Structure 1
């Protein structure tokens, strides 16, 4: 079979040109975990809309003014001749199109995952975003930097330099405390995956891991910031995240 074409956002030498996006990483994870062959095409932030339109793909939401908003990840599957957008929809497509691969949406879990996904950004991803947003912008190629900084600063009404605070660190920890609580409901020995030790990795687990790999890559694995995040709750997150390192092929 031909490699799926995977559209991702590039980076500069600060992070050695590593992919970095929490949103595209969900799909890089899905592909690596499923053992599917793919090739990465690199698209700068301001070129996303153009590229996706030229592919025949669709926007995934609308900006506050009401304009179509195009996002990555997007894939083109040469085996089905289909373009697929929106990370959750892409993961589901992968399950359905490649049924011999491990399922990210086991039967009976779709609505539960939809709900979990809907709260992952407010409770965890957004506070993390604030802690990594400046270093993210500085890891972008020049044209991406200008688009990202201008649009994100416009959005939050602050310079990117003002967003990371200790209050955001408290929000991250509080969000991870909630998550630890949910995982605790599975019982001892089953509290490192949402569906338990023998449940396997779901799309929802990947969503949490994608927040971690984002922070790790942007901050640096040898950094103190990374060490601070990963050390919370007595090293629980180091254990959780360590489950995903085998699936970080680039």
Structure 2
């Protein structure tokens, strides 16, 4: 009767957890110390599971509703909640004696932050990270993932997005680096070079960063040349942020 947490398995790590969006929620559940069970769902099975547990789609597009993980279902409440930001607000509200991740006065600014973060980071990560995460998916997720991502890119095959050693890949990295350079400026805009957005207390905004960053580390690989370069950017700010949350970087087989 614990909270049920829906995740997509991958082969990047033995514990199977790789997704940037589900890591945001997994970090959230771990940081709040709330117990949960993990339910593993292949990409093509996501919509039929959501329909079957009553999860709202996270956006409605031309061709219909679009279902994503993370989803949690809270049996203590009956509620099914989809989207990591919505899950964070739900957990803040339903388990108020856990550490708050979105203090109410910062709620709107957190929603502004998620947009600024998508533009500066998610869009730049894609040409390198999506072909990489595709290469570690189970066969039925690869079929679905390749087909849909290649289609959303106009038909450009993943292998052509940014081949190793190419200049496409090299300029993808430069825009990635610039993106994280912007987050570095936000975190030091008043002269005080912070690791956390609020200063001393963890916020969902920090959980957002480490969620996307642990995705890079785990899929590119901790010993990959590109990841070890990444650890040195902005005097290792991003490596350091990961370290702070390492106690919460946990996939309980239990």
- Give the shorter-chain TM-score range: over 0.9
| Residue 206 of structure 1 pairs with residue 207 of structure 2 | yes
- Find the counterpart in structure 1 of residue 113 from structure 2: 116
TM-score (norm 1): 0.94
Of 87, 91, 104, the match for 1:90: 87
Moved over 6 A (4+): none
Q: CA deviation at 1:129?
A: 2.4
Distance 1:6 1:103 in 2: 19
Q: CA deviation at 1:137?
A: 0.5
> Does the residue aligned with 2:105 lie in a helix, a strand or coil?
coil
Of 138, 142, 145, the match for 2:139: 142
Q: CA deviation at 1:107?
A: 2.3
Matches within 5 A, 1:87-236: 87-157=84-154, 158-164=156-162, 165-188=169-192, 191-196=194-199, 198=200, 200-236=201-237
Q: CA deviation at 1:17?
A: 4.9
Contact 1:186/1:195, CA 8 A, preserved across alignment: no
Q: 1:106 to 1:25 in 2, by over 3 A?
A: same
Distance 2:161 2:133 in 1: 12
1:14-63 Cα distance to aligned partner (Å, 9 max, x none)? 43352111111110000000001000000000000000001112111123
Q: Gaps spanning 5+ residues in structure 1: where?
A: none
Matches within 5 A, 1:3-152: 3-12=2-11, 14-63=12-61, 65-152=62-149
Distance 1:111 1:77 in 2: 25
1:109-133 Cα distance to aligned partner (Å, 9 max, x none)? 0111100101211101221222221
Q: CA deviation at 1:100?
A: 0.8
Contact 1:128/1:211, CA 8 A, preserved across alignment: no
Distance 2:109 2:227 in 1: 30
Quick check: 74-83 or 144-153, which moved more? 74-83
Q: Gaps spanning 5+ residues in structure 2: where?
A: 163-168
TM-score (norm 2): 0.92
- Find the counterpart in structure 1 of residue 248 from structure 2: 247
Contact 1:18/1:217, CA 8 A, preserved across alignment: no
Quick check: 148-157 or 118-127, which moved more? 118-127
Contact 1:194/1:205, CA 8 A, preserved across alignment: yes
Pairwise CA RMSD of aligned residues?
A: 1.3
